[PDB]
Structures are given as C-alpha cells and as structure tokens.
Amino acid sequence: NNPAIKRIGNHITKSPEDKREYRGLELANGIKVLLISDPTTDKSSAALDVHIGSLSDPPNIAGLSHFLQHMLFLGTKKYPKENEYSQFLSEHAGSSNAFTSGEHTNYYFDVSHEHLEGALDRFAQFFLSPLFDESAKDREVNAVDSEHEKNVMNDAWRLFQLEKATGNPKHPFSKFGTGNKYTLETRPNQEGIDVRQELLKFHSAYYSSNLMAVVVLGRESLDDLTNLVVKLFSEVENKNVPLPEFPEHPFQEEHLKQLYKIVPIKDIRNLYVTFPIPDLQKYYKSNPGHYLGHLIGHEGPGSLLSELKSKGWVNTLVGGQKEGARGFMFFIINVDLTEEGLLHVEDIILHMFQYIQKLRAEGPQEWVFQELKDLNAVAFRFKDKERPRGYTSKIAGILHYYPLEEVLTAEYLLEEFRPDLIEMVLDKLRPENVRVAIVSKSFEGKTDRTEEWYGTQYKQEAIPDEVIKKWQNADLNGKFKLPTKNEFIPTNFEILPLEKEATPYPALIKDTAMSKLWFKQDDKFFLPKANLNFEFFSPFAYVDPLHSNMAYLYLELLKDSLNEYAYAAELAGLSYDLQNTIYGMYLSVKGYNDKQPILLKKIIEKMATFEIDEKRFEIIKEAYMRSLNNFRAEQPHQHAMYYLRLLMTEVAWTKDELKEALDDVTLPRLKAFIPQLLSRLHIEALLHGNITKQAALGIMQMVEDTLIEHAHTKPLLPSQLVRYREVQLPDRGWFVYQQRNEVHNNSGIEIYYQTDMQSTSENMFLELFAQIISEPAFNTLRTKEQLGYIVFSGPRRANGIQGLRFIIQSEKPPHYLESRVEAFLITMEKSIEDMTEEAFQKHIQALAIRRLDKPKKLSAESAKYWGEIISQQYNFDRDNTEVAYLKTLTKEDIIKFYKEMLAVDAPRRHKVSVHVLAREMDINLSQAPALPQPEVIQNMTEFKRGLPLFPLVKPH
Numbered sequence: 041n042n043p044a045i046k047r048i049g050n051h052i053t054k055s056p057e058d059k060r061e062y063r064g065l066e067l068a069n070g071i072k073v074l075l076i077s078d079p080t081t082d083k084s085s086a087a088l089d090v091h092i093g094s095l096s097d098p099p100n101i102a103g104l105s106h107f108l109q110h111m112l113f114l115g116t117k118k119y120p121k122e123n124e125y126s127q128f129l130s131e132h133a134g135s136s137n138a139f140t141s142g143e144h145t146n147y148y149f150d151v152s153h154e155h156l157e158g159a160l161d162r163f164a165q166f167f168l169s170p171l172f173d174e175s176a177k178d179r180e181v182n183a184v185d186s187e188h189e190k191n192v193m194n195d196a197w198r199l200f201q202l203e204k205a206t207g208n209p210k211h212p213f214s215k216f217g218t219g220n221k222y223t224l225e226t227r228p229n230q231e232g233i234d235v236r237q238e239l240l241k242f243h244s245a246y247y248s249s250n251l252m253a254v255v256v257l258g259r260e261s262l263d264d265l266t267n268l269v270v271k272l273f274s275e276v277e278n279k280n281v282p283l284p285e286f287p288e289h290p291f292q293e294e295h296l297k298q299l300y301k302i303v304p305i306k307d308i309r310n311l312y313v314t315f316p317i318p319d320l321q322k323y324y325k326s327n328p329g330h331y332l333g334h335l336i337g338h339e340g341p342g343s344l345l346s347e348l349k350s351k352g353w354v355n356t357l358v359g360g361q362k363e364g365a366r367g368f369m370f371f372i373i374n375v376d377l378t379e380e381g382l383l384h385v386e387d388i389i390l391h392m393f394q395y396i397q398k399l400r401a402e403g404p405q406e407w408v409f410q411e412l413k414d415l416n417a418v419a420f421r422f423k424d425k426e427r428p429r430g431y432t433s434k435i436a437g438i439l440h441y442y443p444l445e446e447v448l449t450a451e452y453l454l455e456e457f458r459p460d461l462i463e464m465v466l467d468k469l470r471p472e473n474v475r476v477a478i479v480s481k482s483f484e485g486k487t488d489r490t491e492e493w494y495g496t497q498y499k500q501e502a503i504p505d506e507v508i509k510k511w512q513n514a515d516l517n518g519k520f521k522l523p524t525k526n527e528f529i530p531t532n533f534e535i536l537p538l539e540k541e542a543t544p545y546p547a548l549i550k551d552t553a554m555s556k557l558w559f560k561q562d563d564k565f566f567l568p569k570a571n572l573n574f575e576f577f578s579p580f581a582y583v584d585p586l587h588s589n590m591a592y593l594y595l596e597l598l599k600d601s602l603n604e605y606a607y608a609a610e611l612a613g614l615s616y617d618l619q620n621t622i623y624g625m626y627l628s629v630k631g632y633n634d635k636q637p638i639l640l641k642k643i644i645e646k647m648a649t650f651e652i653d654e655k656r657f658e659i660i661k662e663a664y665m666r667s668l669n670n671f672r673a674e675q676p677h678q679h680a681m682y683y684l685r686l687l688m689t690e691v692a693w694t695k696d697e698l699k700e701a702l703d704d705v706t707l708p709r710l711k712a713f714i715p716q717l718l719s720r721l722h723i724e725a726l727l728h729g730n731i732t733k734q735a736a737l738g739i740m741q742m743v744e745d746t747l748i749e750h751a752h753t754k755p756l757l758p759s760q761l762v763r764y765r766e767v768q769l770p771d772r773g774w775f776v777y778q779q780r781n782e783v784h785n786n787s788g789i790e791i792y793y794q795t796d797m798q799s800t801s802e803n804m805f806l807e808l809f810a811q812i813i814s815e816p817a818f819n820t821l822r823t824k825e826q827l828g829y830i831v832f833s834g835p836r837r838a839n840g841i842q843g844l845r846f847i848i849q850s851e852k853p854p855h856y857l858e859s860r861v862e863a864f865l866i867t868m869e870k871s872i873e874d875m876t877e878e879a880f881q882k883h884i885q886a887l888a889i890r891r892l893d894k895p896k897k898l899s900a901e902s903a904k905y906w907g908e909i910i911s912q913q914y915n916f917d918r919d920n921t922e923v924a925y926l927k928t929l930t931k932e933d934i935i936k937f938y939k940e941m942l943a944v945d946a947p948r949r950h951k952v953s954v955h956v957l958a959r960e961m962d963i964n965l966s967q968a969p970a971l972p973q974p975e976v977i978q979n980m981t982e983f984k985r986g987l988p989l990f991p992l993v994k995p996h
C-alpha cells in the first residue's frame with residue numbers, strides 16, 4: 041500500500057478513561073512515530089527525540105551537542121529568519137524548548153490547535169537543513185556560557201560532574217556536557233577548528249532518521265496526522281548510524297571502595313552511597329531495581345530511614361536505581377546528615393548493609409511485587425490527562441525503548457515476578473562494590489584536589505579494609521522489618537452521579553464566622569480523585585519574626601512526626617502539603633478520594649494535640665538555621681525577586697530578621713505558641729472533585745469539630761482578616777535598591793514598572809502589552825544582545841496590584857542592563873506603531889487562546905479557583921469576561937497605555953529597580969534614552985513608611 045511507511049503496528053494500549061486516539065508507526069527511513077488525536081485539545085504539540093547526546097561529543101569540543109541544540113532554533117534553509125520559529129510560536133500561542141542529556145536530544149513545542157502544520161513545518165526543518173549562521177554561532181555561544189555560569193556554584197551540578205570526574209577518565213561518562221565560551225569558542229579557535237563545520241559535520245553524522253522518534257498531537261484524525269508526518273518527515277536522510285552503547289561501567293575496580301570528601305557551596309551535610317550495577321532497562325516488565333528501591337527507600341515502621349532518624353543521624357533518605365546510559369546504571373542510597381550523623385557515617389553505612397542483609401535473609405516477596413503491580417495499575421488506569429507539550433516530549437523519549445504498542449503502558453505495567461533478578465541486583469549491593477561521598481563544610485582547608493569544570497574541592501581516599509570487613513560482617517539488626525500490607529491502598533472508585541444542584545463554578549456553600557466553604561463537584565474529569573484545600577488564618581503566624589519562625593518549625597515538626605504514617609498514604613496516591621504562610625497555614629490533601637477523610641482527620645488531630653520530641657526539635661531548628669543562611673547562595677536573579685517582594689509588600693520579615701530571632705526559639709516557647717496559634721482561626725476551603733455537597737459539609741465540619749474538641753478554637757472577628765497592601769509609588773518616581781550577591785559572579789536585576797490596581801481593563805492592557813513584547817524581549821536582550829541566559833518579561837501581580845517586570849541575570853553590571861531594557865522599550869513603541877492591524881489582531885487571538893486554554897486535569901482547575909479564592913477576587917468566570925474585553929482593544933489603546941504608564945517620559949511611570957551585584961564590583965545596538973538620577977533606597981523600612989499604600993481589590 042504505502043512506500044513511505046515501513047510498519048503500522050497494532051492497537052496502542054491506553055487507559056480506558058483515555059478518550060484520545062493513537063496510532064504508532066515506523067516510517068521507511070526508520071523514524072518511530074506516535075500520532076495522538078485529541079479532537080477537544082486547545083493546543084497541539086509535537087516532539088522529536090534523537091538518540092544522541094553529549095556522551096557522543098567529540099573529545100576535543102565539550103558541549104557540542106548541547107550547543108547544536110541551541111543552534112537548531114536559529115534558522116534553517118526553508119525558514120532563514122533567525123527567529124522565524126520563535127515568533128511564529130509566539131504569534132500562535134505556542135512555546136518551545138529542548139534539552140540534551142548524555143544520550144538524547146529532545147525538542148518539543150506547543151501551538152494553538154489550528155496552526156499545527158505551520159509550526160510543524162518550521163520544526164521539521166531543524167532536522168533537514170539548519171543554517172548554523174556564523175553570526176548566530178558567535179552570539180549564541182554566550183548563552184551557553186551563561187547557562188553554565190548559572191550552574192557553576194550549584195551543589196547539585198557540582199556533585200553531578202564530580203561523579204563523572206572520578207570514574208574512568210577515558211570513559212565517555214567523564215565528559216563535560218554543557219560546554220562554555222572556553223570549550224566552544226576560545227579553544228577551538230586556538231586549535232584552528234571551524235565550529236560551523238563541526239556542527240554541520242555532527243548534524244550530518246548523528247541526526248539520522250534511524251535514531252529518531254516523533255510524536256504529534258492535534259485535533260486532526262489519525263489519517264490526517266499520518267499524511268502530515270509522512271509529508272514533513274519522509275525526507276530525513278537515513279545515514280544508518282549504530283546506536284552508541286557503553287557496555288563497560290565507568291567505575292571499574294580502581295574506582296570502587298573509594299571515599300570522597302567534598303566541600304559544598306551551601307552549608308549542607310550529605311552522604312552519597314553508590315553501587316555500580318548493570319543496565320536493568322531491558323528488565324522493565326519486572327523492574328527489579330524498582331522493587332529494591334521501594335524497599336530500601338521505604339520510610340515506614342521498620343524501615344532503614346526510621347532507624348537512622350531515631351538514632352538522630354539522618355532526616356531524609358533516597359534510594360533506588362539511577363539511570364546511567366545504554367550499558368550501565370547505578371544503585372544509590374543518599375541521606376542528609378545531622379551534626380551527630382556526620383560523626384557516625386561509618387555506623388550509618390553499617391546500618392545500610394544490615395538492612396540489605398535483612399532483604400537477603402527474607403528473600404524476594406511476591407506480595408510486595410503484587411502491591412506495586414496493583415498501585416501501578418490503578419495509577420495507570422486513572423492517570424491525569426497531561427499537558428500536550430510534556431506528553432509528546434516524554435513519549436518521544438520512550439519511543440526509543442519500548443515497542444510501539446506498549447509506549448503508554450511500559451513505564452507503568454508490571455508483569456513478571458523475577459526473584460532471580462532481584463537476587464542478582466541484591467548481590468551487587470555489597471561493601472566490596474561501594475563508593476562513598478561525604479559532603480560537608482568541615483572539609484574546608486582539608487582537601488587536596490580540584491574538579492576542573494566547576495572548581496569543586498575534594499579529597500579521595502581508599503576505604504580501609506578494616507572498614508569494608510566490618511560492613512561485610514553485618515549481622516541482622518532487629519529494628520529492621522519489611523513493611524506490612526499498605527492499608528491506604530484505595531479500592532473504592534465509584535464516581536458519584538452528578539447532583540441535580542451541581543454548578544459550573546465553585547459555590548459558596550457555608551459562610552460562618554469560623555469557616556467559608558467553596559465547593560464544586562467535578563463535572564469534567566470523572567476520575568475518583570479529589571482536592572481539599574484549606575487556608576487557616578491566624579494573626580499570630582506572622583505577627584513578628586519570632587512567631588513566623590515558630591509557625592514554620594511547628595509545621596516542620598508536625599510533618600516529620602507524621603512521616604512514617606503518611607508515607608503509606610503517599611505510595612497509595614494520596615498526599616498532602618502543609619506549610620505556614622504570612623497569613624497562618626495552608627493545608628492541601630490531593631489524590632484518590634477513598635481514604636482521604638482518614639488522612640485528613642489524622643492531620644488535624646495531630647495538629648491539635650501535638651507533642652514535640654525535643655531531639656527532633658533541636659535537629660530541625662539547626663536545619664532551619666542552615667537553611668536561612670543558605671539563602672545567601674541562591675542566584676542573583678532570585679535575590680532580586682526576593683528584595684523586590686520585601687520592598688513592595690506592606691509587611692515582610694527579612695531572612696536576617698528571621699535568623700536573628702531564631703536563637704530565641706526555645707522548646708518552652710514553642711509549646712506555648714502552638715495553643716496560642718490554634719485558639720482563634722478562620723478557615724477558607726475549596727473542596728473539589730469526586731465528592732458530594734453533603735460529604736463536603738461533613739469534611740469541613742469535621743475539620744472544625746476537631747480543632748474545637750482539642751484546641752478550643754474560636755472564630756476570628758471579620759476585622760482581623762488583614763490581607764496586606766502594596767506600596768504605592770509616586771508618578772515619575774524611580775527607586776533603586778542595590779545589594780551584593782556573595783557567592784555568584786553574575787549580577788541580577790529586576791525592573792518593575794508598577795501600573796494600577798487589578799481590574800478587567802487594567803489587566804488586559806498589561807497582558808496584551810506583555811504578549812506583544814514577550815518574544816521580542818527574549819529575541820533582543822538574549823538572542824541579539826546576549827545579555828544573559830536568564831531573560832524574562834511579563835506581568836507582576838501581587839496584593840491586588842500589578843505592573844510589568846523584566847528579570848535578567850548577566851555578567852554585565854545592572855546600570856548597564858537598565859539602559860538596554862529602556863532602549864528595548866523604545867524599539868517596542870516604534871514596532872507597535874509599525875505593525876499591521878492584522879499582526880495586532882494575531883497577538884489578541886494568541887493571548888485569547890492562552891487565557892482560554894481549558895484545564896486538562898482536576899488539580900489544574902483547582903489551582904485556577906484557588907487563585908481566585910486566595911486573592912479574594914472570587915472571579916471564577918474571569919477568562920470569558922477578560923477575553924471579551926480584550927477583543928475590543930486597538931493599537932491606539934495600547935500606544936496610549938504605553939505612553940501614559942510605561943514610556944521613559946510617561947506622566948505616570950512608576951519604576952523600581954533591584955540591582956544585585958556580582959561577587960566583585962564596587963555596534964548594531966539601538967539607542968538607549970537618557971535616564972533621570974534615581975532615588976537610592978538605603979533602608980527598606982524608611983522607604984515604605986515614606987509612601988502611600990494601595991487599597992485592596994473589591995470582590996465579585
């Protein structure tokens with residue numbers, strides 16, 4: 041029948057709740073393809089995943105395949121304009137990214153449903169005939185440098201590369217994947233390399249159809265999608281590349297029984313234990329590493345972590361199999377350390393080996409396998425519908441590992457019980473096979489070695505044989521038991537029939553002094569799941585830095601106390617989130633609705649009768665202390681956002697104020713605060729999902745009754761429901777606040793042009809403006825001017841007020857970044873004047889689609905309502921209202937707006953700038969306007985005191 045297609049392949053197994061339709065196939069040139077038809081979708085999407093990545097970089101050009109990934113976006117033969125692809129997505133409500141791992145390069149986009157073909161045609165050109173323009177290459181090489189720079193002082197990245205640096209140095213594993221200006225420009229020039237050629241050469245060599253999978257998701261039929269994919273992808277050449285394989289483990293004998301002592305950037309204490317294992321991927325139908333992961337990483341009674349945490353040695357643990365590449369994997373067990381734990385690392389590892397030994401002694405357990413199989417089956421059956429862009433990206437990666445027919449199920453379904461494989465993996469978790477890393481600031485000064493790409497400081501030792509031998513003779517230890525049946529496993533999936541009184545938006549079904557209950561029975565998704573959100577108000581949670589600290593610790597203590605019991609709930613797809621806010625606390629319980637009341641009842645009950653174990657108190661207080669200190673090591677752009685938040689909010693305690701007040705938090709003082717906090721509250725709740733009104737009222741009243749029974753709670757008075765205001769900046773003012781980041785050698789800037797209170801029309805002026813400037817801000821400040829990797833723009837909403845912000849992290853100083861942004865704003869007014877009426881309407885259409893995009897799953901719909909409730913705007917039909925209004929706007933409206941509120945000589949410009957300086961300070965380019973001298977903020981309190989505050993926004 042069809043020369044262009046090798047194979048069609050059978051029905052693709054899907055959940056029976058999945059109304060989308062699917063066709064797998066294989067093109068003549070080798071491309072594995074999944075087509076997904078969703079006739080209701082708002083965005084379409086596609087992804088392409090090439091089975092090549094940085095493990096295949098040339099040894100003399102670290103980061104080449106990552107760099108290539110950047111360059112594919114910057115023009116092809118059919119679409120030579122550098123930003124054709126970006127701007128097309130932007131004008132049709134889409135977005136795109138890409139990533140490169142050791143074996144893959146993965147490219148995906150979404151777009152408005154009726155412009156799939158447009159988007160896909162541009163996308164296909166990436167794989168056919170990229171330009172790699174010489175001038176683009178010179179520019180983009182900075183963005184890749186900047187990306188690396190952002191990672192340099194991050195502990196996760198450093199450990200990630202330290203591991204690669206300590207295996208076999210001639211194994212591809214040890215390569216440097218990101219690349220930087222040095223590896224991608226400086227040194228190749230020094231060595232006579234034409235990088236445009238090396239990119240042409242690599243693309244030509246590795247971008248072979250036989251190494252590619254594609255997924256496309258759209259409203260079209262399967263037949264129409266098929267024709268489409270054949271049309272744009274049959275022409276990719278098959279150069280028949282063998283798939284790279286790495287049968288030899290980068291950790292050989294010389295790499296085993298080694299100890300590493302590493303100095304962190306942040307003040308953290310961790311121990312990483314690693315064993316090399318073979319590639320388990322081919323055993324996916326039984327998944328022996330998941331079985332052992334489930335056991336070793338367990339957190340219930342009888343578990344490894346239970347005992348380490350009781351000895352006061354660790355607070356958290358992670359264990360299980362870790363991806364390597366084709367040919368090798370790892371098995372890891374990593375824990376954080378208390379100060380005691382740091383001195384007992386040897387005993388910790390013995391306990392690990394005792395627990396593994398217990399697994400050997402009891403042997404593989406079919407009922408445990410049975411449990412995971414069941415959980416996986418229920419999860420698969422009732423999986424949330426995914427956002428298109430993530431779904432295609434994720435399936436494109438897995439098309440390389442699974443038969444077409446299984447790609448949806450493979451990662452979920454379990455079919456084979458394999459005590460042999462389990463035994464075989466257990467036989468590698470042995471002291472003679474072990475690598476041990478200790479990350480601690482106590483190693484400062486004591487190290488003698490330095491990792492080349494990140495500068496990490498470490499020491500490497502043989503673990504002494506006395507130590508191996510002691511671990512090899514690990515007896516059983518009776519504190520360690522396998523877990524018992526998981527009683528939280530759900531079994532009731534009945535979907536309650538939709539009630540006669542069901543509304544499309546949440547309804548206020550209870551409005552008392554104690555509690556305000558918003559409710560909606562799910563009428564869209566029909567999965568046996570529910571979301572229960574509660575905001576608890578207490579003035580005592582933020583009355584001062586000390587109380588804030590206590591609110592925090594109280595909740596951390598509570599979570600830590602519930603963990604053993606909650607963990608079973610989590611494996612059963614039932615979880616919770618519990619945190620202190622500047623208003624009091626937030627509690628959310630999400631998941632299968634079956635056993636939800638039980639978990640929820642337990643939490644409130646513990647909350648109200650809580651008894652603190654003081655060793656837990658002391659460990660958590662110390663972790664929190666480190667945690668506040670560690671803020672100093674966050675990125676300059678985060679610092680900028682943090683300072684602006686502190687400047688524009690009526691009330692806010694700084695981390696310094698918090699750390700200072702922390703020494704005063706005693707056990708006595710915390711026991712006193714808890715009943716104080718719970719004595720008067722107000723509760724506002726959204727209960728949303730597979731539940732009825734009457735079950736909702738029941739749950740609300742149960743939460744209330746428990747607080748009353750156990751903590752005597754009474755109502756707050758309507759007047760004590762303080763929501764905080766934003767600072768109101770003067771017409772034509774400009775304020776700068778400046779700080780130094782002490783760890784990172786970039787600077788950060790945030791610029792905020794405050795506009796006015798939120799409301800239908802102020803909202804849409806800002807949003808439309810943001811839409812129009814979005815891609816060009818990126819295209820100009822990043823792609824042309826190459827000011828940094830991080831370059832953001834868009835609305836700021838806080839405390840009912842709003843405005844336009846830019847964020848940039850750069851090597852260049854902030855005074856300079858200011859001026860490039862102002863230069864950019866002029867370029868924007870000129871281009872709004874110059875654009876066609878129709879280009880104008882496309883932006884409207886594009887924002888329109890963004891706003892009207894239906895939530896694909898329960899919790900996305902909850903989040904939307906929840907934001908209407910926490911903001912106290914309660915505007916559930918906001919998207920229709922605001923989109924109706926948006927369709928009436930014109931170029932004259934936006935030009936006016938820009939001229940009123942935004943332009944440099946705007947009558948109502950209100951500008952504030954946070955400059956975060958790098959670790960050590962004290963052309964083709966458009967003209968930047970002359971700026972006024974700013975008012976430099978010296979003291980955040982004086983500043984606020986000296987300014988009006990805005991009203992709060994009226995409801996409805």
Ligand SMILES: COC(=O)[C@@H](Cc1c[nH]cn1)NC(=O)CN(CC(=O)O)C(=O)CCc1ccccc1
Nearest residue numbers: 330331333334337338339357358359360361362372
């Ligand atoms: C089945 O395996 C598991 O149950 C858990 C282990 C665990 C410990 N405590 C609670 N659960 N999860 C994992 O092992 C998770 N896995 C990550 C993932 O699921 O994507 C990993 O092992 C990777 C850990 C890692 C290493 C380095 C940097 C980031 C993350």
Ligand SMILES: [Zn+2]
Nearest residue numbers: 106110184187
């Ligand atoms: Zn990148």
